[model samples]
Target: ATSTKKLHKEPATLIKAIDGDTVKLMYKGQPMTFRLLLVDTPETKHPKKGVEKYGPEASAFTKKMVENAKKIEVEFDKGQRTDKYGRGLAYIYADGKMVNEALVRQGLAKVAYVYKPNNTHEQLLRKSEAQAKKEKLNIWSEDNADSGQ
Candidate 1:
């Protein structure tokens, strides 16, 4: 139930993926886009900027993850659906898992920022991102395993 009396909620739909941590969604009879919070993947390309190590891999990984989805859940935070450039700023979920949090868990991104208004997984995602950095996995580094273990 949404938009009548109860709070709004929508099952996430993956219409298209923008990159490793961003996707477009079909929600509430409109097309919405979302940015994965807290986590900075490597830059795919830059004219005067060096590649951020695992940028390509991060993007590829994200692309593969969301390629097959038709829809996903849309959980709004405490703001409008679009940011300044006009993109839906909402937490995303598919298969009962948070996509933004998943990327952090996979070491594909870093904690960018936890906005005050719409931070659904602010606490947990922070922990996940910190652990990812500590372990230095995937985007954390090119190393696949720890020699100490």
Candidate 2:
């Protein structure tokens, strides 16, 4: 487990956006995969799972943000370095913006509260989600065909 102390941020090259919240990157000349912490978007390309509502849109949004990014940075939280599946858990910063917060603010993802140990951005993410709900953004709008809300 990671300590509550601050962790250093590092640069990485965006390889691809796996879905709305998962990304592949090049770190230190090796390929590494990371899942954005504190956010969960609908599933797009799950192996045994079918697509969920707004899945494609979320994936597209993430793709556009990362693919066009000038630079990407990653910062870990106070929790395990990797998930059980071995993917790194992190907050992805692309083009100078926090991608996890962007997703929640835009209603492209939900706030995942499962990782209590790494709750560094919990309050901020919840605030963003509340704003999205108040504004009836994508996932919060009942009439949104893609959102299935």
Candidate 3:
């Protein structure tokens, strides 16, 4: 589905950074969970797969950013607001800086989940991931597919 809408960041308050790519925010004074689009970091809280490599580090970095920020915001794409599982799919910014892009830039996450209409930040995310991969940072340090959540 397509719509003639101008996407921009809307005000949100950080409830918490659940993990690397997941966070809880107070959007419009209502608490909700948002999953970072195009940024899939290792999962620290998976049920069957308890803590993948660099998962805890991923959690630590995001938590630091979201928790320490005095301001927060969220940007949604033109596609469906939530995934098939009903988790809000979005891009999160802390104090005006995008944590999604930041995580990719830091090599703590990878550019994944490329749903066409929801790819507002795909180019930037992939660019960041490329740089980090070239530098062999964190998850990129290894030559295996074990970095996913």
Candidate 4:
């Protein structure tokens, strides 16, 4: 599992949890926004989006973990630092636990928006999604009555 890539991990302070996959943080000196790598959680807020399915639960869970964690860090991949929207793209760690993977593990997220080479955590992230699907949890609910996918 050695891709010979040394990811850069930087300490960060949580400023706000914008949504499940989006967050505001104080990295280094300036406040910045980050989009978790290789995972996409449902949207809770959009000026016109109004809402999304399972968005409430996903946001609450994400906010809970981030707000509760004492130590936070961001693992930067080996490419451009920001996306087209200028959100820093990286994997987040809360108290040493990878939050991005956790969401997928609980079936709240799906592996997405991956370009290439910047996938240091893709294996683990995808594996978590696999486990969640195996369990038919949340978004993977095999039987949905009214809850949309």
Candidate 5:
């Protein structure tokens, strides 16, 4: 397990939003894909499967978040820099707030697929998810009944 410490935090130049929980950016002059740690939005572009429920809403939410951001930052976990596919696992901050946490708080994402040591915000994420569930927001509502909430 990686150390449960913050490795680094730096500004990132936003490139594009891949979905609600993934984005492409330029960090330290290198192009990288950052997957928002601890948050999982509905899948909008699954290679083997079609779009999932609430996918479009999540995509739209992410697009708005990225497009309107005045500044963005990336916080690297203590260890496990990248996944097997080379995507950097991180916590994204847009306009000063952690995007991963915000997404879950807003009901657009869930706390999912947590990795040990790197889950610095696991408790907070879970709290946000619980609040979302209690409020029946987004995927928790019948509007997204297919989401398996």
Candidate 6:
């Protein structure tokens, strides 16, 4: 549940997508879990709401990004490196690109209102989102609009 800024350079294989924003990657020959920073895609499923808007697209988008990705890099944000769920919090890079920002750019996700100092990619994510919204790509103009926590 704490965040830490540490650079991890490893060759990996993404073995699973726990959700749109979380994945289990094979790091150092073992499965390591990490959550993309500053994004909350529409919920994929909930007992009460079922799948939310953009859920499928978000999942698919993440899948596409990691399907065969390699040589991944991770940089955490100081001691705030983990979620309560024990997943590493990071600015993930797939083949040298930021996955969080890429997701926003592709419209599969959106910024999560991160506070400053902890919001390094805030501007970038927002810019990507603006382009996605303008293009009506993926979830931007989708019909899954039941928004709630």
User: Which one is best on lDDT?
Assistant: 4
How well does candidate 2 match the true structure in TM-score terms?
Answer: 0.82
lDDT of 3 at 122: 81
Clashes of 4: 0
In the range 1-149, model 5's lDDT, one tens digit per residue, is 56884355788887888778678988889989988887777765564565555657777767788778868888887758898898888888879888888889888887878768886778888888889888888677765465665
Give the per-residue lDDT digits (tens) of candidate 3, residues 1-149. Answer: 44865666788877866778778888878878898888776655564666556657878878898888778778888878988776678888877888888989888887887878887778888888899998888777877665785
Q: Rate the local accuracy (lDDT) of all candidates.
A: 0.68, 0.82, 0.80, 0.83, 0.80, 0.74
Ranking by lDDT: 4, 2, 3, 5, 6, 1
Kindly report which residue stretches of model 4 are placed more than 4 angstroms away from their true locations once superposed.
Answer: 1-5, 45-53, 144-149
Tens-digit per-residue lDDT, 33-137, candidate 6 = 888888877776653665555557767767777775665676776547667988877777877888888888887787876864577667888888899898888
Off by over 4 Å in 6: 1-11, 28-30, 46-53, 142-149
> What is the overall TM-score of model 3 with all chains considered together?
0.81
RMSD of each: 4.9, 5.5, 6.1, 4.5, 5.5, 7.0
State the displacement of the C-alpha of residue 25, model 1, in Å, after optimal TM-score superposition: 1.6
TM-score winner among the candidates?
A: 4
Where is the poorest 10-residue window by lDDT in model 6? 1-10
Please say which candidate is ahead in TM-score: 5 or 6: 5
Kindly list the per-residue Cα lDDT of model 2 for residues 40-127, writing each as its tens digit. 8776566456555565787787888888887888887878888988788989888878899998999889987665788888999989
- How much is the lDDT of residue 128 in candidate 6? 84
Cα-lDDT of candidate 1? 0.68
Per-residue lDDT of model 1, residues 55-76, tens digit only:
5676666666666444556677
| Clashing pairs counted in every model | 11, 0, 0, 0, 0, 14
lDDT of 2 at 124: 91
TM-score of each: 0.74, 0.82, 0.81, 0.83, 0.81, 0.74
The TM-score obtained by model 6 is: 0.74
Shift of residue 81 alpha carbon in model 3, Å: 0.8
